[PDB]
């Protein structure tokens, strides 16, 4: 599969067709491996957002009246098409985001998993029927679609996060307007085209490109019923407040600071492999990336020297090269912020075991590249421990026993993911049932739940009370109706009745 | 059972014991049938709210560690005690609220139904277990309690609405702080005493009396996790906004304007009986009360003359008299507001078929009594159609056919309850699946769902995305955790392993 | 699509490849439209059955260890292949069975529906997890595959009935041996080939052709765990007895005698259309075919004259002709038995309104053709009312009111399907909740439940206690295991633990 | 609580009242601690069985028409009564069965748990409702009662096993006829009296005493729909065959041979305590009793010497003495058979570490008493390993590693219960998912599942395909009905419609 190249402007999607921007405002889109802009993306105004919402509202009733099995068959055709063109989408993601090609393939596969789950929506839409609640009265419940829903997605997963939202929403009978991240929008348009090739009626799925202005226009529109958001914690709080102020259902996912605990009885080699992978995959630009390593007892001297040796030997380069393990950062501002965090960590007393600054890649000297960074003797009061770096920086914190590690983890402001490596059943049971984290792994560095369970963190990692996809996602996109029924005597109509 | 009389001050409940107020501010509590104050209720300050929250937080961990079956057994003993003392509670409710004694007995029975449902919580807390999601990895989910939750309840159901909230919350493993309506608080204290007699540990259930100040103190406290509110629409919106601003889970129920549709093929006598009962039970002080009668075709001339004849013959008096069908209004200000609504309805062109103003009850001349009021030829642009009166006022709106009635109902701002009387299966099916209302009745004037389904309206009748009690109530009070587990080889420990 | 022609012998399927018979015994296979044999089918001995069972048992462990999502993906590829080659399978079914081409297409579509449901097996295999049943003890359940299962299918649905069984059994992790009807076996082999093209491992699905001897060999084999059977009532009882005697799980479906009730307030034209279709589709060779019309009140004179007029105008001929509505009978012996039933009905006093005997089709004079037959004034004591004819014969029974019809239906020995045509809600509710029939239709002549509900009749129509496909089908193919877990203190291993 | 004494004849229960026997045949009932008969029990003939079945069939329709919530309230009152009189029932059980008083109290508590689960039947009877399966068609399922069901129970649990059956059957809407064990029938009558005091209508619950003749009369009766049986394997197979031959739903539970595995990393003291308790509680007369101890590696020398030391120090005497840990055997024939098994074990080469024969209890010299017996070096080919002794006999089998123990357990003919003691997570996971046993314990000697999961073994331990109580028990007592509904246009009735 050849590398993705294109210079045309990136527009919006409306009525089952691409449309060029009309506001006159554009933003450059960079190739991170080259360090220069390659195309532009239009920034939609209020009128284009209103046009997309009107199209979705016009399309909603007929799509809602469609039986769920036919909607599932449309999603089945879309799944076939997605399996057909996975390499092209992965190449687009590598070109714009900058991750490794195999990582993009894995992201596409993870989105296809959610689509596979959504294909079975007739089973998921079962209501409850109760007969003879009193003498001659029956009572049953069902769930019905809301209307027009909106989704706002980040840059690090331009394909998987939209697949967390739109398949289930379309399966339950809603219409969707998507606002992708402006740093890598092309994938969204690609997906929309595939949705049109699968037989989806026009207006059911629309795309608008833009920034904070388009988000505010979406949040203020009275014809929008629900909002799903994925991003950082402050923006999630702002989105939740503004959407609740206008009377909408909101779910918003925030940031993370994920810990991995190594017990004295853990497998050392597997723990080192897990730490390396989960800390330096995709250059640490994942919500489930491990950023703090908690070392218990005397295993620290068996972990830090090994991990450092693996950190210096990472292969860094262009994402389309097969042997490359880590790609560049998305933008230069993010790279500068990561370097500032490293400088702050050095200034506040943490030991800099491995320094990744000042990296030059041959043939990619202008790319936004950096090396892996490893700290030691990190303290809870340091800024590199409390704040989210979102880069290839790993810190090590040493504790005396299991209870100290549990208390340290429970005191953090984030509750997204946690992992523990051990061979003892009782320790695993107590850690699983005592930790204040939404997603827990036992010898699993990145515990992303399956498509039929749902994704969601605790504390400041989630604003709302429902999770993404799964049965939680099904319930978020529908509203419950109850019906109580009885009849009187029919002898009036005739003796036969 | 004798009438309830008492002159002691009404205080708060803390640590399994009543406590007198310490702020120094009190509010009078009236007997509506007599028209004069009979006791006082203390208004808690910020310090007393903080004390209650601290007690609940101290009690939370041990109660959460208790197995669900033992919590269910505590609730079972509480159910036995509630069945033992139902008449005393009903007499208290009649004395303070002013409803008929049989109506109070029905309210207590409806609360006991929710307690009966909550007794079966071990079945409801089943998680999902999946084996071999990949080779050697298992994945399971569970739901865990939130912590300290708060409930805010209105005056019209001083017993049933608190039973919508605290039984399920206690069954799932939370601690509860209740803020009852200050117009009739005594019942809450009674319930708390019963909860202590059933073996509930101290601090798990606390009561604070007060007003907007106590509500703000509860909404601002950082140790409170969830808020449940029942009341009018503006206060519900205010509560939701203020609680979301501090990062809490919120559910808030608002007002209503319930319609009943009479089709040309309906049973006339049963329709008249249903209209009379559902419009003039409890003096129209119910969220599920019918306030608009929609008459289709030529049945209007068969409905209005009959209903009016029943409206003039209502027996009105003190709630403890067995023959009385309707009691007084809760306060004199509410009576004045209802009379103002009647005057407005006369001024705007509606025909006043039956006028209930200027009623004097022999022996209860100082009571807040009023008669039944019936309007005719009500239009959608009138204020008596758009706004909630919350009194014994019924208006009649005439339409030409089924579609006009459906369009009229779907254009209202409220979506709480709706009813339709017919003998045709297709009309019932289309009405049930097309109406934009949360709770639907077919020949059922007041379609309150069963304890295992849940209570909730649509549009401006509910702020949030979860319903009260049932599985929705169970999910509102818990948070989901996912666990993924795997193990490595054990050959290192020995050849036997 | 051309008509299907082939003269090769029909063999068995083993280890992912066709195999020729080795017993030396064959049976002729007829083309019903031509009236002559066109090919042969081998009849397997005991050794070939044992070979198939051994292959399935050898393949079972690896297939059971496969994660459910990969099995679902194999079924997804099989679904794609089935959608690709539906017309060829329909042509084969028309050539051997003799039904109309559109009817065969509908049968293939109905099987594809069950495959679509089975593709979502990871959701269906969720167990129950409960935490802290007592202090420190957890309890969870799961369902695991049985092993080798066997299926026995009739002639009238050579594709749909096997799809009732093998997709769910393969999804839950079992291996399958199929014994198709010897009258039309080719479709089974076709399906097996498709299953091999989708990536199914060898030995997971095997086919053996034969007769009572092969069935007895399957029922006596100690390595077979479960048996599913579809056929007539006496054979179902025999199969259940013989399989239970050897300690196996059994489900067996029997015969039917389906009634349709016409109320005085029903739509006459729609009732006539439903009666014609459900009585003369596929020449009455369906378990859900309507064979008795129950007429209530004075509607009989509006039903019998119309239906008869439609019965004389049926177009009968070769199944590949587009304008043909009814095809021939499967064999000449069945045609002779149907004619004997008609003669018996004439002899016992029923009025022969329309006689279908003595039919000659131009160009198909040797085919097993017969016309539609209509009786009137049928009594419960007649043999044409009590016994199943399984042909294009419809009888009419007149009753006075609703209760008489209900009592008549509840006294029959069969309980498979029932239908009622009315416009009254109360009558529909009472009929649905009072009738002693497994499958009920309100204005639906053939109420076959959806893929996510399950298929099953009552009384003599089913031997066992579980239904086919759906959650019932999932539970039939799995066994439940419970696990209770606890751990002791880990302080012995170290102070850190 | 005083010891239970009574000399009146034990009769049957009919129409909510005790009735004396009329056949003229009686059987003596022994006090095992005294060794002499104390009363008689009548053995019902065919006519009395027919009378009980007729009474149940007469009572069935009204009980089935009762709403489930009222049936649940009847069960709630019964639960209150059972909690009130638990000590009297325990004393009766101790007097007739001969177990320790605390053991009888535990049995009563375990039955009360099942009653508590059954009190929540309205939630469990939820059907599935699906809207718009096609355009204008809805489909929903429900479950309805079967009719008259019969239960047959053993001697070792005269209270708990009947509570496995009749509460769920009554909750789902059936009528029950009970055939208790003739060795200790009084408890059944006691329970029936309590059921009458709770408001149960007459004829819903009937009791018949007897033996094989009464069982055959029950199995042959055409008005009985379902049979539940608990007992030994040969009788279970006979009952299943005879009940299937007459077309009934059957579930039958058989015998057991439960193994406990001790790993080298297990806690030695806790393992010894578990072995002693689970092997010598209730004199080994439990289906979940541990009869084989599997010792892996070098732990055998740390287990056998300790266990033997505990086996010689057991306190044996009358069950009403507080300090007694083990009571006598139920009959003298059972004691003789146990002694014969011990003699056979000595003859076939097993080492008799501890011999319990020749025991004399001071003051109870005529009682059917025996001591604890411990064998060592037991082989799979011995009769004491393959056959069920059902007494206080424990054998020890030594294996080399984990795989040998798993292979040994999987080769047995019984699959009821299994336990494994270890501190390693991976070993526990592999043992739980690989063992061919229905009920599994990790560090739990007796893994009886909770009331909301269900009880059932595998292989020769269960005949049928459904388990006892839980959702399996709910599904066994009900049959599923499907309803598909649609309506035509209503414009014919009028323009308004
Ligand atoms: N949707 C439902 O299920 C439901 C049920 C019952 C009643 N209601 C509604 O309740 C209303 C009648 O009850 P009410 O008159 O007691 O309602 P309300 O709005 O006064 O709510 C009562 C509660 O809110 C508190 N409250 C009142 N004003 C407040 C303020 N400004 N700030 C903060 N807290 C404040 C009170 O102290 C009390 O605890 C009607 O509108 C009726 O429709 C709704």
mmCIF file of C-alpha atoms in Angstrom, chain C residues 65 128-130 133 137 139-144 240-241 244-245 249-250 267 270 422-425 428 432-444 447-450 452-454 458 464-467 471-472 475-476 479-488 493, chain D residues 65 128-130 133 137 139-144 240-241 244-245 249-250 267 270 422-425 428 432-444 447-450 452-454 458 464-467 471-472 475-476 479-488 493:
data_model
loop_
_atom_site.group_PDB
_atom_site.id
_atom_site.type_symbol
_atom_site.label_atom_id
_atom_site.label_comp_id
_atom_site.label_asym_id
_atom_site.label_seq_id
_atom_site.Cartn_x
_atom_site.Cartn_y
_atom_site.Cartn_z
ATOM 1 C CA UNK C 65 -10.883 -23.578 22.978
ATOM 2 C CA UNK C 128 -23.645 -13.823 36.043
ATOM 3 C CA UNK C 129 -21.050 -12.432 38.463
ATOM 4 C CA UNK C 130 -21.862 -11.634 42.101
ATOM 5 C CA UNK C 133 -22.004 -13.139 48.581
ATOM 6 C CA UNK C 137 -16.334 -14.939 48.723
ATOM 7 C CA UNK C 139 -19.668 -16.447 42.937
ATOM 8 C CA UNK C 140 -20.043 -16.527 39.159
ATOM 9 C CA UNK C 141 -21.637 -18.767 36.541
ATOM 10 C CA UNK C 142 -20.787 -19.548 32.929
ATOM 11 C CA UNK C 143 -22.055 -21.841 30.175
ATOM 12 C CA UNK C 144 -19.834 -24.305 28.314
ATOM 13 C CA UNK C 240 -37.114 -38.926 22.468
ATOM 14 C CA UNK C 241 -37.652 -42.284 24.180
ATOM 15 C CA UNK C 244 -33.361 -40.608 26.794
ATOM 16 C CA UNK C 245 -32.825 -44.341 27.339
ATOM 17 C CA UNK C 249 -30.383 -34.320 25.962
ATOM 18 C CA UNK C 250 -33.263 -34.417 23.473
ATOM 19 C CA UNK C 267 -61.805 -7.421 7.609
ATOM 20 C CA UNK C 270 -57.860 -9.565 4.251
ATOM 21 C CA UNK C 422 -60.394 -9.090 14.763
ATOM 22 C CA UNK C 423 -60.345 -5.332 15.322
ATOM 23 C CA UNK C 424 -61.228 -5.425 19.047
ATOM 24 C CA UNK C 425 -58.471 -4.991 21.622
ATOM 25 C CA UNK C 428 -57.345 -10.016 21.108
ATOM 26 C CA UNK C 432 -53.828 -14.315 23.370
ATOM 27 C CA UNK C 433 -53.748 -15.046 27.094
ATOM 28 C CA UNK C 434 -56.327 -17.883 27.158
ATOM 29 C CA UNK C 435 -55.432 -20.067 24.153
ATOM 30 C CA UNK C 436 -53.343 -23.186 24.838
ATOM 31 C CA UNK C 437 -51.030 -22.724 21.859
ATOM 32 C CA UNK C 438 -47.318 -21.970 21.735
ATOM 33 C CA UNK C 439 -47.422 -19.464 18.854
ATOM 34 C CA UNK C 440 -50.223 -16.904 18.507
ATOM 35 C CA UNK C 441 -51.082 -14.431 15.764
ATOM 36 C CA UNK C 442 -53.397 -11.412 15.843
ATOM 37 C CA UNK C 443 -54.291 -10.669 12.205
ATOM 38 C CA UNK C 444 -51.122 -12.629 11.314
ATOM 39 C CA UNK C 447 -46.995 -16.239 13.289
ATOM 40 C CA UNK C 448 -43.415 -17.510 13.045
ATOM 41 C CA UNK C 449 -41.407 -15.803 15.820
ATOM 42 C CA UNK C 450 -38.303 -13.760 15.111
ATOM 43 C CA UNK C 452 -34.181 -13.682 18.798
ATOM 44 C CA UNK C 453 -37.313 -15.235 20.367
ATOM 45 C CA UNK C 454 -37.408 -18.928 19.434
ATOM 46 C CA UNK C 458 -47.163 -26.955 23.104
ATOM 47 C CA UNK C 464 -38.854 -31.783 25.711
ATOM 48 C CA UNK C 465 -38.713 -28.478 27.552
ATOM 49 C CA UNK C 466 -36.652 -26.135 25.334
ATOM 50 C CA UNK C 467 -37.388 -24.366 22.054
ATOM 51 C CA UNK C 471 -31.927 -17.853 23.854
ATOM 52 C CA UNK C 472 -33.701 -21.197 24.304
ATOM 53 C CA UNK C 475 -29.301 -22.712 26.513
ATOM 54 C CA UNK C 476 -30.057 -26.113 24.961
ATOM 55 C CA UNK C 479 -24.291 -26.594 30.319
ATOM 56 C CA UNK C 480 -23.973 -24.281 33.315
ATOM 57 C CA UNK C 481 -21.002 -24.253 35.695
ATOM 58 C CA UNK C 482 -20.825 -22.346 38.986
ATOM 59 C CA UNK C 483 -17.597 -21.163 40.643
ATOM 60 C CA UNK C 484 -17.244 -19.932 44.237
ATOM 61 C CA UNK C 485 -13.902 -18.361 45.124
ATOM 62 C CA UNK C 486 -12.109 -17.048 48.213
ATOM 63 C CA UNK C 487 -8.528 -16.476 49.360
ATOM 64 C CA UNK C 488 -6.672 -16.430 52.673
ATOM 65 C CA UNK C 493 4.864 -14.486 51.547
ATOM 66 C CA UNK D 65 -55.226 -16.150 37.479
ATOM 67 C CA UNK D 128 -39.268 -9.777 25.925
ATOM 68 C CA UNK D 129 -41.058 -7.101 23.886
ATOM 69 C CA UNK D 130 -39.876 -6.032 20.422
ATOM 70 C CA UNK D 133 -40.084 -6.295 13.777
ATOM 71 C CA UNK D 137 -46.004 -5.762 13.516
ATOM 72 C CA UNK D 139 -43.695 -9.426 18.818
ATOM 73 C CA UNK D 140 -43.512 -10.316 22.505
ATOM 74 C CA UNK D 141 -42.978 -13.421 24.622
ATOM 75 C CA UNK D 142 -44.187 -14.454 28.064
ATOM 76 C CA UNK D 143 -43.979 -17.508 30.318
ATOM 77 C CA UNK D 144 -47.030 -19.239 31.786
ATOM 78 C CA UNK D 240 -36.779 -40.099 34.310
ATOM 79 C CA UNK D 241 -37.489 -43.047 32.008
ATOM 80 C CA UNK D 244 -40.733 -39.434 29.889
ATOM 81 C CA UNK D 245 -42.621 -42.525 28.705
ATOM 82 C CA UNK D 249 -41.140 -32.745 31.936
ATOM 83 C CA UNK D 250 -38.601 -34.368 34.264
ATOM 84 C CA UNK D 267 -2.554 -23.469 53.679
ATOM 85 C CA UNK D 270 -7.133 -24.525 56.736
ATOM 86 C CA UNK D 422 -4.236 -23.174 46.396
ATOM 87 C CA UNK D 423 -2.841 -19.641 46.519
ATOM 88 C CA UNK D 424 -1.927 -19.393 42.809
ATOM 89 C CA UNK D 425 -4.222 -17.496 40.452
ATOM 90 C CA UNK D 428 -7.183 -21.727 40.100
ATOM 91 C CA UNK D 432 -11.980 -23.899 37.231
ATOM 92 C CA UNK D 433 -12.199 -23.867 33.442
ATOM 93 C CA UNK D 434 -10.884 -27.408 32.781
ATOM 94 C CA UNK D 435 -12.643 -29.591 35.376
ATOM 95 C CA UNK D 436 -15.730 -31.511 34.219
ATOM 96 C CA UNK D 437 -17.802 -30.750 37.313
ATOM 97 C CA UNK D 438 -20.955 -28.684 37.700
ATOM 98 C CA UNK D 439 -20.014 -26.962 40.978
ATOM 99 C CA UNK D 440 -16.467 -25.757 41.678
ATOM 100 C CA UNK D 441 -14.835 -24.325 44.786
ATOM 101 C CA UNK D 442 -11.549 -22.444 45.166
ATOM 102 C CA UNK D 443 -10.570 -22.758 48.844
ATOM 103 C CA UNK D 444 -14.275 -23.499 49.482
ATOM 104 C CA UNK D 447 -19.387 -24.865 47.041
ATOM 105 C CA UNK D 448 -23.188 -24.710 47.180
ATOM 106 C CA UNK D 449 -24.302 -21.905 44.828
ATOM 107 C CA UNK D 450 -26.427 -19.002 45.999
ATOM 108 C CA UNK D 452 -30.079 -16.714 42.534
ATOM 109 C CA UNK D 453 -27.714 -19.029 40.603
ATOM 110 C CA UNK D 454 -29.055 -22.585 40.857
ATOM 111 C CA UNK D 458 -22.935 -32.909 35.469
ATOM 112 C CA UNK D 464 -32.354 -33.688 32.336
ATOM 113 C CA UNK D 465 -31.170 -30.303 31.122
ATOM 114 C CA UNK D 466 -32.270 -27.793 33.795
ATOM 115 C CA UNK D 467 -31.036 -27.050 37.310
ATOM 116 C CA UNK D 471 -33.562 -18.747 36.897
ATOM 117 C CA UNK D 472 -33.169 -22.375 35.794
ATOM 118 C CA UNK D 475 -37.734 -21.694 33.507
ATOM 119 C CA UNK D 476 -38.376 -25.346 34.399
ATOM 120 C CA UNK D 479 -43.702 -22.646 29.248
ATOM 121 C CA UNK D 480 -43.015 -19.889 26.727
ATOM 122 C CA UNK D 481 -45.669 -18.316 24.496
ATOM 123 C CA UNK D 482 -44.995 -15.928 21.608
ATOM 124 C CA UNK D 483 -47.475 -13.337 20.304
ATOM 125 C CA UNK D 484 -47.209 -11.442 17.003
ATOM 126 C CA UNK D 485 -49.676 -8.594 16.529
ATOM 127 C CA UNK D 486 -50.729 -6.171 13.790
ATOM 128 C CA UNK D 487 -53.784 -4.093 12.891
ATOM 129 C CA UNK D 488 -55.366 -2.758 9.707
ATOM 130 C CA UNK D 493 -65.344 3.168 11.570
#
